[PDB]
Design a protein around this ligand. Structure first.
Ligand SMILES: *[C@@H]1O[C@H](CO)[C@@H](O[C@@H]2O[C@H](CO)[C@@H](O)[C@H](O)[C@H]2NC(C)=O)[C@H](O)[C@H]1NC(C)=O
Ligand SMILES: [Ca+2]
Ligand SMILES: [Ca+2]
Ligand SMILES: [Ca+2]
Ligand SMILES: [Ca+2]
Lengths: 303, 4, 67, 5, 292
């Protein structure tokens, strides 16, 4: 009788050996990726002759195509590179943030989010100009200074791994300066993705919903806590857990700068911290779904 | 060129 | 006499955590490597087999229910 | 995602 | 009994478990590796001036992209500067080399400029008319224009013009030069005798002509040269020099391949038949005093 299923629960050998094999794999991959990263990717973005204060102005000066341009929002600002969308709904869109292939790490510290990071654009096959956008984050200061030039609207777009897409429009958009921790301010919503920014996740109720509201929040990076998650525990901070820099409350309804989970569908036992740190927009696909495309564009409103 |  | 019981059941209850953790590092690495494509000469073309991870967890969880 | 009180 | 086994799954567990720790080490190290963006080969030099010459006189030594801010200009803007050993700064405003950029544009597009700027100068473009106006008229000192052509045989010629100025938009960015200053490409702006009407040469001269695009007619043709020949240029019923015309691979083209049966290629009658389109074109200006 005794020792009924002993060598039965010896399946731990099979399990462990395998994992021991799964590990030999990962170590291999990191080595190669370590080697491949001996020579950096390169682009050659010849600069379009026409320039402006921002994308909108440029399109009014003949900038018909969507590509990287050079804009100088203000005489005091050093002209900088940015990707202009001159096709989506009237063009003149200045891309602020963009996700499409997970080629860029969005979980960076405070300074990289302030300065901005990523690839503004890459070359389109043959052509000598960079007509495709890259994954990037313009920079909290450039962004702020932009929304602060005058009435600015914000168009957020996302696409799932099924081909479908939805948008979130905010007739009013405003990011304050660093001194004001880039406090986001949005209004005049309309669209097909939920109003996650101003209302919070529809899935949620009570104060649960309201604490996932982003409007009015401060900008947080994992090395800079500014989320509305009041706790002394250094481990319990939104940014650290949910992915990267963003206007976290406690914590989110939308997380444009999260982790680029492939296939969209992901789970907690996959998530580094068991939270929904993907590129989420709960209001449209729950929290366990990382979009395939996610972008943020801005443009002067009208007044 | 010239347009007559 | 049963030196191997509370040990086996814990060693398993412990390797079962090694699974959950590997799955995350599996994923974490997959994602980390790709965030490289837009920074290096070229990125390693890789494929994450996480269907098998579920299959070993399930298998084990069934086993972790004997005693 | 939220964090319950 | 069977405990010698419980060891293996510990020798193994604890091993690949530690291995998990050393992997996150290398993983993190890689993470620190893929933080940079891709290096953009195009860079803009830190020197600035009132024009490529000023910038050159200021020390600049290689050709490339620089910011210039002419006198009466309210905003610095990028240009391609051509700098040779002798320390000459040609501010280039036009460039053709491959049919890459579409030159059939409108008034605004020609006023503002189109195409791209490359440090290597292997890019096609048209700096803004306004920009050109500002540069050439910015101050007392006079400018000079050097039109530089190249056929499909590798041969190249030039045509120089003194006191090159471009009027304000109020005067349709009129083209004005004091006189041809020689060059083996001939003086196409002086017009050209084609044979028919005895006004062939008169109606094909450009000095004094105003700019014209399809949407802003200022040519001396009761029709629209800019619209027919489909470009932007100083039309006069119509032209003898048309560096902003359709790019024709191989240079040779017929009145058949033309939309309206009219030569609309990149021509310079004083150097090649109007049915032969240049392979490369360059329009650059430099202070006059720089040539003597
Ligand atoms: C907000 O969320 C919390 C938890 O996410 C809900 O609080 C209860 O939490 C306890 C333990 O965590 C559970 O046993 C209850 O089931 C939770 N409430 C239920 C029934 O959902 C809280 O209720 C949520 N607020 C609502 C109702 O939207
Ligand atoms: Ca990171
Ligand atoms: Ca906090
Ligand atoms: Ca004649
Ligand atoms: Ca006319």
């Amino acid at each position: 009788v005794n020792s009924n299923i002993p060598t039965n629960l010896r399946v731990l050998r099979s399990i462990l050996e395998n994992l021991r094999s799964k590990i030999q794999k990962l170590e291999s991959d990191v080595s190669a990726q370590m080697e491949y990263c001996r020579t950096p990717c390169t682009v050659s973005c010849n600069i379009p002759v026409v320039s402006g204060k921002e994308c909108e102005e440029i399109i009014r000066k003949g900038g018909e195509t969507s590509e990287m341009y050079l804009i100088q929002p203000d005489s005091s600002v050093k002209p900088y590179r940015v990707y202009c969308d001159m096709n989506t709904e009237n063009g003149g869109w200045t891309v602020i943030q963009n996700r499409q292939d997970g080629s860029v790490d969005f979980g960076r510290k405070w300074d990289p989010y302030k300065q901005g990071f990523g690839n503004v654009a890459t070359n389109t096959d043959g052509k000598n100009y960079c007509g495709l956008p890259g994954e990037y984050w313009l920079g909290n200061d450039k962004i702020s200074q932009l929304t602060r030039m005058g009435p600015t609207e914000l168009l957020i777009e996302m696409e799932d791994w099924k081909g479908d897409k939805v948008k979130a429009h905010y007739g009013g958009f405003t990011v304050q300066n660093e001194a004001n921790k880039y406090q986001i301010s949005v209004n005049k919503y309309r669209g097909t993705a939920g109003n996650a920014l101003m209302d919070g996740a529809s899935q949620l109720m009570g104060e649960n919903r309201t604490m996932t509201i982003h409007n009015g929040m401060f900008f947080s990076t994992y090395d800079r806590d500014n989320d509305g998650w009041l706790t002394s525990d250094p481990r319990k901070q939104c940014s650290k857990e949910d992915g990267g820099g963003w206007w976290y409350n406690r914590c989110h309804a939308a997380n444009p700068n999260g982790r680029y989970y492939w296939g969209g569908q992901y789970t907690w036992d996959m998530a580094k911290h068991g939270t929904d740190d993907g590129v989420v927009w709960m209001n449209w696909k729950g929290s366990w779904y990382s979009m395939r495309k996610m972008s943020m564009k801005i443009r002067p409103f009208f007044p | 060129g010239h347009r007559p | 006499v049963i030196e191997k019981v509370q040990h086996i059941q814990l060693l398993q209850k412990n390797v079962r955590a090694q699974l959950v953790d590997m799955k995350r590092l599996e994923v974490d690495i997959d994602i980390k490597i790709r965030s490289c494509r837009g920074s290096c000469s070229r990125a390693l073309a890789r494929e994450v087999d996480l269907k098998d991870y579920e299959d070993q967890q399930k298998q084990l969880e069934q086993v972790i229910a004997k005693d | 995602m939220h964090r319950p009180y | 009994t069977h405990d010698s086994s419980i060891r293996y799954l510990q020798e193994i567990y604890n091993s690949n478990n530690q291995k998990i720790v050393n992997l996150k080490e290398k993983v993190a190290q890689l993470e620190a590796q893929c933080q940079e963006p891709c290096k953009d080969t195009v860079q803009i030099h830190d020197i600035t001036g009132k024009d490529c010459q000023d910038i050159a006189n200021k020390g600049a030594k290689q050709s490339g992209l620089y910011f210039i801010k002419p006198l009466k200009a309210n905003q610095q803007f990028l240009v391609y500067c051509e700098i040779d050993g002798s320390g000459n700064g040609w501010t280039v405003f036009q460039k053709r080399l491959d049919g890459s950029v579409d030159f059939k544009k409108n008034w605004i597009q020609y006023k503002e400029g189109f195409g791209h700027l490359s440090p290597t100068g292997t890019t096609e473009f048209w700096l803004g008319n306004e920009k050109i106006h500002l540069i050439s008229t910015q101050s007392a000192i006079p400018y000079a224009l050097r039109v530089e052509l190249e056929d499909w045989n590798g041969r190249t010629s030039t045509a120089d013009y003194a006191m090159f100025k471009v009027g304000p938009e109020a005067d349709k960015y009129r083209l004005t030069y004091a006189y041809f200053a020689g060059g083996d490409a001939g003086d196409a702006f002086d017009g050209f005798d084609f044979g028919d009407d005895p006004s062939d040469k008169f109606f094909t001269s450009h000095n004094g002509m105003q700019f014209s695009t399809w949407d802003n007619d200022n040519d001396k043709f009761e029709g629209n040269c800019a619209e027919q020949d489909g470009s932007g240029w100083w039309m006069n019923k119509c032209h003898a020099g048309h560096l902003n015309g359709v790019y024709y691979q191989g240079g040779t083209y017929s009145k058949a391949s033309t939309p309206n049966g009219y030569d609309n290629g990149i021509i310079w009658a004083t150097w090649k038949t109007r049915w032969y389109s240049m392979k490369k074109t360059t329009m650059k200006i430099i202070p006059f005093n720089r040539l003597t």
